[PDB]
Amino acid sequence: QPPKCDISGKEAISALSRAKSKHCRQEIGETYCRHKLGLLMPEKVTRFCPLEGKANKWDEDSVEYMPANPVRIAFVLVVHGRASRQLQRMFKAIYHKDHFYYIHVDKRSNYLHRQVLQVSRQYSNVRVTPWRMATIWGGASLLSTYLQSMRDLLEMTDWPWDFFINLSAADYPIRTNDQLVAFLSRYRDMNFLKSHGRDNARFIRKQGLDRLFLECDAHMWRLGDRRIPEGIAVDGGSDWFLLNRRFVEYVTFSTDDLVTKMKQFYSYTLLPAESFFHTVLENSPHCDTMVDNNLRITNWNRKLGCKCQYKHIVDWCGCSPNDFKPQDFHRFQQTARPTFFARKFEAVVNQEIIGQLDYYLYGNYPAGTPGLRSYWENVYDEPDGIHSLSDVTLTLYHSFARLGLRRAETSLHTDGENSCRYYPMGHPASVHLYFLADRFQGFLIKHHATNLAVSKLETLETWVMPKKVFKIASGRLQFSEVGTDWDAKERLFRNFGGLLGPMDEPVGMQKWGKGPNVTVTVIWVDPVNVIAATYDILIESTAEFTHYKPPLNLPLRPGVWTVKILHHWVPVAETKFLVAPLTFSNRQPIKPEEALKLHNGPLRNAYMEQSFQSLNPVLSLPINPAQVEQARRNAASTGTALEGWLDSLVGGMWTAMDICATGPTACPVMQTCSQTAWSSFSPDPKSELGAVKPDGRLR
Ligand SMILES: *[C@@H]1O[C@H](CO)[C@@H](O)[C@H](O)[C@H]1NC(C)=O
Ligand code: NA
């Protein structure tokens, strides 16, 4: 169907041409045409503040007194992702029985929501939002989430709260609850918001406040220009704040000119929570309550955090803070200004700094407490279904489980019946990442299998760990790795296991120490010694990481690839990586014609237009005609033959470290999972939540 008005703006045309759903196209057009007539945005707004401008209203010993009328705090936790045990650890740190906790879990994070429900069922002062939005980065929906949660909280008459504080799963306190309550009790009529403080016209342009945006199909579309309304001062800064009940009441229930028109304006705004509350407060009757300090330390690093990493999500470029590391601990003790929270923290990136901070605030755990240096994070959970996995991860998780079953059989030494022989049943039940002392240890896979001696089903967990493959030879090179999903801000691969299939596009990374600039040669070698790519790269004196994604035609030949680094044909180092053949297509066993198309190498017979056959003799990489033919045979296989090819490849690159039983077992040499040090079933008291103590705490 055609639009209600001629659509000629280049930005709107670009959005309409990229939008996937008919609903989104119609809403894009409806929004554009409304604005074109001048009926969508306000252009003049009343200012109620009696001040000429802004108001901008520290002794370390002032947070040590004991208040007679302590504030009660409503924490709104806006969380997403997989890091449930870290969220539980932070919740333990900030919990007190006289506060309140209201938890919004991103609609797309169903595993995390199930874990949060278990928390809300234990404690009367914890509730979960029954509505759930998909709060994409920069989305307008983040303000809708805050405004709805404020209305909900104001109508819970059994929760008499005095302040509203927002936190994510990557936040952590840097002072005790006692000190937070003492400080807020002394300034209970103030509002804590941090402004950019620099040139305001530049802030408006950098933020895109003079641009019209629309959130639809989990994307933020830019649709054109708009005027800043006259009569008000527009301000902004951090979207992390603390607001008192009186101002939250005004924002929620006022119908005056300011609140009404700003709610309309910010419904079509990028990063609305970074400026909506500043602009309303400063122009409201409450303007003289504003303190230019959000009581947070935010770990900005412009060199690493501003790589326009959200381009596929919003029609704009943005920045995000870095994760703290152990060398940052001294920053949590600064004395310039009062601060009570900090971000960001990620246990999969660095857990040591989280431990240092928690023990600093609340003391060591007793000697003999297990799991303090470990971290477990669920990356697949059965209720979400195998269609939420990929064919690559479904194939490999199956193979890891079979590797565990083979370890159980070979671990029993006996000349009679082997009561540790198993037959696998069904699909993996769960998968965890496992870390120890900030070193990746591999995957834990929970699975079901029949013990063949007694003919009974058993539930097991297998630990698999990747074999070391980086090898140096007689420079500033420290490490080399191949992977996917490179995180330029944290400088690591978010595909932690390096799981790859024939249609993946691998990335080569190098890590360097200090020294003078140098140039090296990178060579990619496929499983039958076909040289797929060669290139030189400059390593500047100041470079720490380098990475590059060669344009290799697909599919890649399955097997063990090798990536070599040379310095003027002198060997430097090498690493290896596995392109796995897939046993599933659309989560069903792969058929002969599917496998042949997928497993016989690139459709162009060559990985790139330029050939490197003249290099094979130079590097002693002869192509064996027998191995080439065997790869053709392997490509046509399915079923049991294909399973044997896959498992021999996986076994060459992964080790089954151990396997345990969750319940009873007829295998005499298998340990109970809860009694191991490594299982996701073993004790982890730092993330466990129990009964409330006499002092009202869980920690
Ligand atoms: C480093 O770079 C400079 C120019 O930037 C170049 O002249 C020099 O040859 C390079 N290598 C060394 C060791 O200086
Ligand atoms: Na509850």
Residue numbers in the entry: 253 to 309, 313 to 729, 735 to 959
Tell me what the authors wrote about this structure, in their words.
We obtained crystals of a human XT1 construct spanning residues 232–959 and determined its structure at 1.9-Å resolution. Inspection of the GT active site revealed patchy electron density for a co-purified, unidentified ligand.
The first enzyme in the pathway, peptide O-xylosyltransferase (XT, EC 2.4.2.26), catalyzes the transfer of xylose from uridine diphosphate (UDP)-α-D-xylose onto serine and thus determines the site(s) of GAG attachment on the core protein. XT1 and XT2 are type II transmembrane proteins consisting of a short amino-terminal region facing the cytosol, a single transmembrane helix, a stem region required for Golgi localization (Schön et al., 2006), a catalytic GT-A domain (Lairson et al., 2008, Müller et al., 2006), and a unique C-terminal domain of unknown function, termed “Xylo_C” in the Pfam database (Finn et al., 2008). To better understand the initial step of GAG biosynthesis, we have determined crystal structures of human XT1 complexed with UDP-xylose and various PG-derived acceptor peptides.
